[PDB]
Structure formats: structure tokens, C-alpha cells
Design a protein around this ligand. Structure first.
Ligand SMILES: Nc1nc2c(ncn2[C@@H]2O[C@H](COP(=O)(O)OP(=O)(O)O)[C@@H](O)[C@H]2O)c(=O)[nH]1
Lengths: 181, 199
């Protein structure tokens, strides 16, 4: 419903709160009855709009390499660590971190679990190849940045429902928690 | 007892092993008096490399972590100065066994970065671990690669662990648990075993 101040601006007259309540009650009563097209337009003169926060999720385009393989690229950030990931449409679950296999680049099991989380959530383990380059930060910041970048790249090969589920799981959101002065 | 020495070895002015004595005596002299332990190892090697050539028996030289012989040590003198690997009688007598100046056997060895001195964690190829000196010493040699489990080996290892009831988590037998194990270990036998240890 139009707010009180917007009704003020459109009417070019100041009105109290109770009379705005009364007008909104009349509008709701009109809505309840079998209002026609003219009455529907008259009501729509008084109803503003709103938006969502799922269409603002950017799905990166699918590129093609020289060999004709489809892929998708993305970026992620965590503390001072910055990651740039490429996810291939087809693969065997090979992840190369700075040209090094992930189990060698990430000795700690926690980081390997962080890298596993995006594919396990959408059940695509062993179905994609990943080539990612990370720089800066520590082991955990690098793992988080890689996870974000690789989820943002994987959004291209999944359904929109799966993209929304990944968003709601907190996978496609940059973590803004950084060291304070 | 079948193998018999071919020279008189003098442990001390009082004690010596006479020619023709069984090899076990020498070993016993090394097991009883540790003062002559290191001298007793070399003699054993000196016999085995020799007699195998004569054809008495076949000898297998199996050295794990062979990359240590031509590297560096963390041992010091009393002047806090470093000691080289060739200064150690135990290491100096084992290099002679790596040379292919004998026949009647085979020499098998396996590299290992675990426990190595002055090597990065990710160095695994022959030169990176051996060094120039080590590669030259072993050259010519036949290298054999050991990789991670292929899908058949990984599935068989997990079936063995399940057959021993070693995976107690209720989800581990399921296929999703196997995919998660495969990803977290990447089919590496050691990582898979360590992760299955506490499941
Ligand atoms: N106690 C004792 N040890 C010996 C005797 N002879 C050889 N050895 C040991 O057995 C090993 C035989 O290796 P060898 O061919 O003689 O090497 P090298 O003489 O130092 O060049 C030596 O390293 C000695 O430590 C001996 O007559 N008495």
C-alpha cells in the first residue's frame, strides 16, 4: 500500500494518520468486492511495487576453450586471499590449485572439506574439473576464497533452483568479516 | 651357518674370527659387544656382495629411503661442525652395495621424502630427492612409479575395510560416503587410511 507521505504528495494535502487508515480500509473493502477492470486500475494507482534478491544473483556466461570444451570462470575473495577459478562442464573431479593437486596444495582436511562443500551440496562430486589460481592470505582464507569462486563458477551449470539453494546455504556470499583497527 | 667367512677378522687382540667360521658368529659378535657392531655390519656386507657373485646364493638389497645416502646429515662433531654422509661407516659401507659391480641378485630401493633432511614437502621425483650425486651413483637404474589408487583399487580397499568392520559410521557404507572419501583423500592410500582410522 502507498505510504502516508506518498498519498500526501499525490494529493498535495497534509492528512493525519487516522484518515489515512480510513482510506486504506476503504481501499481494502473495494479490493474484497468483485472489483472490475476500471476498479482494479483505480486500486493499482494506490499500490506501489517491491523487488526480490534472487534475480540479482549473476550467473556467469559459458565460454569455450580452443578444444571446444565449455567452461565458466569466476572470482572469490576471503580476507586478503583472492581466488580465480575455472570450472569445466565435464570432468573427473580433478582440482588444480596453482597447478598443484588439491590434496597436495591443502594438507589440512578442513580446507579439503571446504573445497568439497560446493559440489557435495548440489551432488556434482566427480563430475567437474576445476583449475583455480589463488593468491594472498593464509590456508583458510585461500580455501574460503576458492570455495566462493568455484561456487560462483558452478552456478552456470546448475538449475536456477540449485542456484537459489546454494545462495540460501551461504555459498554465493562474500564474507565481509575482516581484521579491524 | 651355511655361509662361511673367507678371511680372519680381528675384533681385538684377544678376539678374532677365524677363516671358515660360519657367518652367524660375526653377527653374534655384533649383537653381544656393541663396540664392534658397526664393524660387524660392514663385514657382513663384504661377504654377501662377494659370495653371491660366486653363486652360493641370490641376494636382494632392499633399501627404503635410499635418498638418504647421498644427501646431508644433522649429525655434528664436538666442534659443532657438520658431518657428511660418507664419513659414516654404516653409510659408506652401504653405498658399495648399491654399485652394480656384482651379480647374482637384484638391488631394489624406494625413495621417501618422509623423514628426509633438507628437502621440500612436494619433492618426489628421483633427482629432486637423490641429488646429482645420488642420481649419478644409481645411474643406470630402472625407475618404477607408484600412483594413487585407481577406482578399482580404491573400491577394493574400502571393501576390505568394510569387511573388517573398520568403518563404523553408519553413512560410510553408502555410496555418498564413498564419494566423500574419494574426494577428501583423492584416492591417496595414506590419506584414505588416516581418514578411515577415526570413522
Ligand atoms: N673389527 C674389524 N672390522 C673389519 C675388519 N676388516 C674389515 N672390517 C670392517 O668391514 C668393512 C669391510 O669394508 P672394506 O672393503 O674393507 O672398506 P674400506 O677398507 O674402508 O675401504 C670395513 O668397513 C670395516 O669396518 C677387521 O680385520 N677387523
Amino acid at each position: 500500500w502507498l505510504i502516508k507521505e506518498e498519498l500526501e504528495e499525490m494529493l498535495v494535502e497534509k492528512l493525519s494518520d487516522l484518515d489515512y487508515m480510513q482510506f486504506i480500509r476503504l481501499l481494502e473493502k473495494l479490493l474484497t468486492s468483485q472489483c472490475g477492470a476500471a476498479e482494479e486500475e483505480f486500486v493499482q494507482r494506490f499500490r506501489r511495487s517491491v523487488t526480490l534478491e534472487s534475480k540479482k544473483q549473476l550467473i556467469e556466461p559459458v565460454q569455450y576453450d580452443e578444444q571446444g570444451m565449455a567452461f565458466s570462470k569466476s572470482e572469490g575473495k576471503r580476507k586478503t586471499a583472492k581466488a580465480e577459478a575455472i570450472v569445466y562442464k565435464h570432468g573427473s573431479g580433478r582440482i588444480k590449485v596453482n597447478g598443484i593437486d588439491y590434496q597436495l596444495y591443502f594438507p589440512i582436511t578442513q580446507d579439503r572439506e571446504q573445497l568439497m562443500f560446493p559440489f557435495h551440496f548440489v551432488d556434482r562430486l566427480g563430475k567437474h574439473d576445476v583449475t583455480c589460481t589463488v593468491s594472498g592470505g593464509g590456508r583458510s582464507a585461500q580455501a574460503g576464497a576458492i570455495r566462493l569462486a568455484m561456487a560462483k563458477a558452478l552456478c552456470s551449470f546448475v538449475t536456477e533452483d540449485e542456484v537459489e539453494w546454494m545462495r540460501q546455504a551461504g555459498l554465493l556470499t562474500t564474507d565481509p568479516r575482516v581484521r579491524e583497527r | 651357518n651355511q655361509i662361511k667367512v673367507q678371511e680372519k677378522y680381528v675384533w681385538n687382540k684377544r678376539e678374532s674370527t677365524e677363516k671358515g667360521s660360519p657367518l652367524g658368529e660375526v653377527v653374534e659378535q655384533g649383537i653381544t659387544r656393541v663396540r664392534n657392531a658397526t664393524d660387524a655390519v660392514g663385514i657382513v656386507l663384504k661377504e654377501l656382495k662377494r659370495q653371491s657373485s660366486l653363486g652360493m646364493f641370490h641376494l636382494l638389497v632392499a633399501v627404503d629411503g635410499i635418498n638418504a645416502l647421498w644427501g646431508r646429515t644433522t649429525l655434528k662433531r664436538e666442534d659443532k661442525s657438520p658431518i657428511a654422509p660418507e664419513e659414516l661407516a654404516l653409510v659408506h659401507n652401504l653405498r658399495k652395495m648399491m654399485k652394480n659391480d656384482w651379480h647374482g641378485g637384484a638391488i631394489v630401493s624406494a625413495l621417501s621424502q618422509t623423514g628426509s633432511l633438507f628437502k621440500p614437502r612436494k619433492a618426489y621425483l628421483p633427482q629432486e630427492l637423490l641429488g646429482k650425486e645420488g642420481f649419478d651413483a644409481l645411474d643406470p637404474f630402472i625407475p618404477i612409479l607408484v600412483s594413487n589408487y585407481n577406482p578399482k583399487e580404491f573400491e577394493s580397499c574400502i571393501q576390505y575395510y568394510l569387511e573388517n568392520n573398520w568403518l563404523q559410521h553408519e553413512k560410510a557404507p553408502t555410496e555418498e560416503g564413498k564419494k566423500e572419501l574419494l574426494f577428501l583423500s583423492n584416492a591417496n592410500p595414506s590419506l584414505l587410511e588416516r581418514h578411515c582410522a577415526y570413522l
